[PDB]
Ligand binder design. Structure first.
Ligand SMILES: O=P(O)(O)O[C@@H]1[C@@H](OP(=O)(O)O)[C@H](OP(=O)(O)OP(=O)(O)O)[C@@H](OP(=O)(O)O)[C@H](OP(=O)(O)OP(=O)(O)O)[C@@H]1OP(=O)(O)O
Ligand SMILES: NCCC[C@H](N)C(=O)O
Ligand SMILES: [Zn+2]
Length: 482
């Protein structure tokens, strides 16, 4: 076998925690924000956000909704609309006459690439440049690059491209944005809500029997884990307030940087403490937010994390990190489906266009005369969903899904093509699928980092051996029907 092509899907590099407030309103002033649209509307322009802020202040005075919940939205928008990455999503709910009866107001902020992202992307670009210059130098001449429109994703694509070609500047003709392929799609959101509601009793209610729900034996039931996290969160809230109120906070870390100062720290945790103070109220969506900030602070605000939660790897803190990782490893992946059928549909509804694109590119690479590579830089969601398509296709795998490592920043899915032009002109092809969990550490509270705050990438692990190409395409294309 000899290498012919590579189709590699790459997730975004290190980024700031993603946070969101979501509330639904039916009052006309909130419906008018859609401006007649009956599909999801995204607002990013800062001036449009200032207009919405004014609308929220009107809504508050008019009591066009829960005033307390409108206040938090308005105050959060006012503070964050001047920060890159802040956007508003308006999801209309249509009645039986295709009339908007309700709109979901989602305020999102964060998710920006950190200063560390460039190291992870550059590391990957240099390693792959090395790899290609040892397999076939001609591969560098046939690179095709796609990217999501999300800022953290394109940031990753740009530094990877610079490292791969060894270049400073870069033209817009080299990276092609494909929103249809690599951005999130609300196509599966109708079915992901069915899943989200099925998870709430598991985490809140004292006893709810799950069918086909992976969970480690050494851990108690999920609702107990939630109750202990709430206890740990309420515990750390009191420590943090006591330390802010009493001690000099500006001396709890010898060096502060952009996005790494105690005021932003308190803002993030104040939100999470509010959302993790009642086990019977915990939203499964907020487990990922809790774990994302915990990764961020242990990675970018390590010293302050120690000192502001010091009562006087702290044991109550290590316990909190360990329990949060369990919830993120066995609850968050199942927002993309609990049962195999759910993981399959949701996986298809989300990433079918990308999946077809990969197979077609793989199909083209067989027929080429020159070796090539196609890199897809994608939002986090497509990696989860695409792996589910791989397993639920019936393709023989080398490792089971439950055994797969936790997906982290810059995790990759790889489709390696090898051609068999031997046996006369008869040309056969084998495809081997590999993945990497990205830049991950299993001991975030114990690793010692320098000013780069940079986690190295984990080498790839093989999901399959060399499989007949025509076989691997049929098993995938058989599931595209439903
Ligand atoms: O208006 P919505 O229906 O679009 O959104 C509501 C819905 O959220 P979700 O569907 O998961 O997105 C409720 O979930 P759910 O399980 O009851 O599902 P259903 O209500 O049957 O649809 C949720 O109640 P819970 O999960 O805590 O029990 C409620 O939270 P909270 O603020 O405490 O308000 P109240 O519960 O005190 O009224 C939400 O109100 P918003 O603030 O407007 O978002
Ligand atoms: N129509 C459902 C898929 C469309 C996708 N949410 C998009 O706007 O790209
Ligand atoms: Zn940092």
């Amino acid at each position: 076998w000899v290498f012919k092509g590579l189709a590699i899907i790459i997730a975004a590099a290190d980024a700031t925690p993603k946070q969101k407030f979501k509330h639904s309103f039916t009052s006309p002033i909130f419906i008018s924000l859609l401006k007649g649209h009956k599909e999801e509307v995204v607002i990013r322009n800062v001036n449009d956000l200032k207009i919405v802020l004014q609308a929220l202040r009107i809504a508050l005075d008019e009591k066009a909704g829960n005033p307390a919940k409108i206040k938090v939205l308005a105050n959060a928008l006012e503070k964050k609309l001047n920060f890159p990455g802040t956007k508003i999503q308006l999801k209309p709910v249509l009645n039986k006459e295709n009339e908007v009866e309700k709109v979901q107001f989602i305020l999102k902020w964060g998710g920006e690439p950190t200063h560390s992202a460039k190291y992870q992307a550059t590391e990957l670009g240099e390693q792959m440049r090395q790899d290609f210059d040892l397999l076939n130098k001609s591969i560098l001449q046939n690179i095709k690059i796609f990217s999501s429109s999300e800022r953290r994703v394109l940031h990753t694509a740009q530094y990877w491209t610079r490292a791969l070609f060894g270049a400073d500047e870069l033209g817009s003709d080299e990276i092609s944005i494909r929103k249809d392929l690599l951005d999130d799609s609300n196509a599966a959101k109708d079915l992901m809500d069915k899943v989200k509601k099925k998870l709430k009793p598991l985490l809140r209610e004292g006893k709810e029997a799950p069918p086909q729900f992976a969970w480690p034996s050494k851990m108690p039931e999920p609702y107990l884990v939630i109750k202990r996290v709430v206890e740990l969160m309420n515990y750390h809230k009191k420590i943090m307030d006591n330390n802010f109120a009493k001690k000099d906070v500006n001396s709890m870390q010898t060096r502060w940087c952009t996005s790494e100062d105690p005021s932003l720290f308190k803002e993030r945790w104040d939100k999470l403490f509010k959302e993790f103070n009642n086990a019977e109220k915990v939203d499964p969506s907020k487990i990922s937010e809790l774990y994302d900030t915990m990764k961020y602070d242990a990675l970018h605000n390590r010293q302050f994390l120690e000192n502001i939660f010091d009562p006087g790897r702290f044991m109550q803190l290590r316990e909190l990190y360990k329990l949060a990782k369990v919830l993120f490893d066995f609850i968050c992946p199942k927002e993309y489906g609990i049962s195999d059928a759910e993981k399959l549909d949701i996986g298809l509804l989300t990433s079918l266009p990308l999946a077809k694109q990969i197979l077609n590119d793989i199909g083209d690479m067989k027929n080429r005369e020159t070796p090539a590579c196609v890199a897809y830089f994608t939002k986090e969601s497509h990696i989860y969903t695409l792996l589910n398509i791989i397993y639920e296709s019936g393709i023989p795998m080398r490792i089971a899904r439950n055994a797969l490592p936790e997906l982290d920043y810059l995790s990759q899915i790889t489709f390696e093509l090898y051609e068999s032009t031997d046996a006369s002109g008869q040309k056969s092809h084998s495809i081997r699928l590999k993945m990497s969990p990205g830049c991950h550490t299993q001991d975030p509270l114990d690793v010692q980092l320098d000013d780069r705050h940079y986690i190295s990438c984990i080498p790839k692990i093989s999901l399959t051996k060399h499989l007949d190409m025509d076989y691997v395409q049929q098993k995938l294309r058989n599931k595209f029907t439903r």
